[PDB]
Subunit: 95 residues, 4 copies
């Protein structure tokens, strides 16, 4: 699950995020999910959650996801950071 | 100049409420007069510039809630509670860069 | 869960080496003196157990290095550059170590 | 597909024994005969170059085995359960011919 942390939502931002959702939906079944949270509505980080810098995890991501992320972080200037924990599977462990 | 090997307490906030700023100046003040030298408060607002630096990261507030002393415990728990402004924080030893704060 | 803490720094290593084990000793010490209750240090020799568990992952070293404290960054740094033995690394929350993880 | 977008199955492998290379050769072969223009196999021996590139990550086996073909999964089941050689795997996407840039 790709966790995005954003500062507010704009039209272009929402469009690009729905596009990102669409891509993880088209070519990433059960291997990539998306959780976007707005820091303008939810600043309080809780428990295991954390925020890493964009160039930290972007370089290791798929390149269309890389171009979408790069867009969000450079053009729209709304993405503050991301996190990929991810504790991924279909059946809960900890979690 | 110096106790040296200073702790760098980076706080990550979203906006500056009229009361939040005074709480900040308070925190800074007590860190200066009561913990002279050992600390260094670095305030970072996400809203002023969203894009985090490559060296920056944000940890949860319940973490780093056993390390720091109590008089700033209350201020941190507050900056999380009364005003929903505090996202998270980080604590670094350094120093990698210079000319930052004299 | 409990003992609840802390942020665990997993180091992925290709074989045990005198210099490497000395450096890891040092790193563990630093982590348990300054950043006690903040950073744990977990070594994994890939030569002993190459198979990653379902939860584990290996991010590249120059990925999470940058966001780590300088005293750790230098050790990991030479651990990759000076005497090349370090594979990737990772940073997770929970759950214990040494105790250790079971 | 505009006009071509190819899969890049990266296998993170701990050393190269005698009898694992024939299974990799075979896997490669079936990746080229049944499928084609899709599954591009890239094998990274972590023992020849411990230093993971910044573009590289290593994930758990089943986590990506979710989307893999049955014969391929039989072969990775082999490499992981038979001789402890497969550390992990990663799946990238790209138009690779001709594109050394990657």
């Amino acid at each position: 699950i790709l966790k995005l942390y954003v500062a507010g939502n704009t039209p272009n931002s929402v469009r690009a995020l729905k596009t990102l959702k669409n891509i993880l939906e088209v070519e990433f079944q059960g291997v990539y999910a998306l959780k976007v949270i707005d820091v303008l509505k939810n600043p309080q980080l809780a428990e295991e959650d954390k925020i890493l810098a964009t160039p930290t995890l972007a370089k290791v991501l798929p390149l269309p996801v890389r171009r979408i992320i790069g867009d969000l972080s450079d053009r729209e200037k709304v993405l503050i950071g991301l996190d990929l924990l991810y504790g991924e599977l279909q059946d809960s462990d900890d979690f």
